[PDB]
Amino acid sequence: MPTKTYSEEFKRDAVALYENSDGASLQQIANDLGINRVTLKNWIIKYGSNHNVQGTTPSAAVSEAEQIRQLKKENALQRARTRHPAESCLEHHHHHH
């Protein structure tokens, strides 16, 4: 199985777009990129944790565990990132769990 890679840059840019929410709706951001608004919302809270959200809970490292276990275990996986991504997925992406 090839890795459907996504750089931190994408998560980073997603949250950076949220900084511009003054003129960009939550939907507009995700809709413009082509991603889910909930998946977007996840990264927003995950990286933009510092706020009037609560006291102090390390949430950034909760969802990151996916990336952690990948990089922590096998370096062989790094060569799978070299594969071309799957843009077609945005077409056949319909609600299904």
**What are the residues whose beta carbons fall under 8 Å from the beta carbon of 41, sequence distance 6 or more?**
26
- Give the type of residue at 39: T
CA nearest neighbour of 35 among 10, 60, 7: 10
SS3 84: coil
CA distance 14 to 79: 25
* Amino acid letter for position 94: H
Characterize 67-81 residue by residue with b for buried, 16 or more Cβ atoms within 10 angstroms of its Cβ, and e for exposed. eeeeeeeeeeeeeee
7-91 maps to CATH 3.20.20.70: no
One-letter amino acid of 32: D
